[PDB]
Amino acid sequence: EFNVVPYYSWFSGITQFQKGKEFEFVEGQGVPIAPGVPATEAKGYWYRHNRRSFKTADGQLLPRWYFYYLGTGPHAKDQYGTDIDGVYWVASNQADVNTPADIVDRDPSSDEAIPTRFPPGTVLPQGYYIEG
Numbered sequence: 001e002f003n004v005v006p007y008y009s010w011f012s013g014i015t016q017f018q019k020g021k022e023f024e025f026v027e028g029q030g031v032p033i034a035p036g037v038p039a040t041e042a043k044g045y046w047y048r049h050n051r052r053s054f055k056t057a058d059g060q061l062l063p064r065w066y067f068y069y070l071g072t073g074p075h076a077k078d079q080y081g082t083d084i085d086g087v088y089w090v091a092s093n094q095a096d097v098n099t100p101a102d103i104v105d106r107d108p109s110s111d112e113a114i115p116t117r118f119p120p121g122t123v124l125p126q127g128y129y130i131e132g
């Protein structure tokens, strides 16, 4: 969970389940589908949430990534494509990444997270489980 309230993603997360596997998409891919959003607005980034478990006397919790439209979320002011640890930038070939997406953030319980799905043809990152 989060002990500091997060910026809320419109979408469900993508959880790592195999070590060493890289979170990636093919250029032009990796923007989750939201009804009615034009392709020109399909631009943003996945943000890594590093998770931490507590110590037991048993025997580790891998990161989960969340999507934010460009100009929103915890890296709202960073430039598209810039090398930042824990930020993976994605955009439709139709999007102009110089301009923020004109896309209101989500919440209250005015709207729940949209289950993450990608269009046919999307190369899915092996070793990751899409929540939902």
Ligand SMILES: Nc1ccn([C@@H]2O[C@H](COP(=O)(O)O)[C@@H](O)[C@H]2O)c(=O)n1
Pocket: 002, 006, 007, 008, 009, 010, 011, 012, 013, 014, 015, 049, 064, 066, 112, 113, 131
């Ligand atoms: N910083 C954030 C932003 C949204 N969320 C949300 O939590 C849900 C995803 O569940 P999991 O974290 O268990 O994958 C979605 O509703 C998603 O938007 C989150 O867990 N951390």
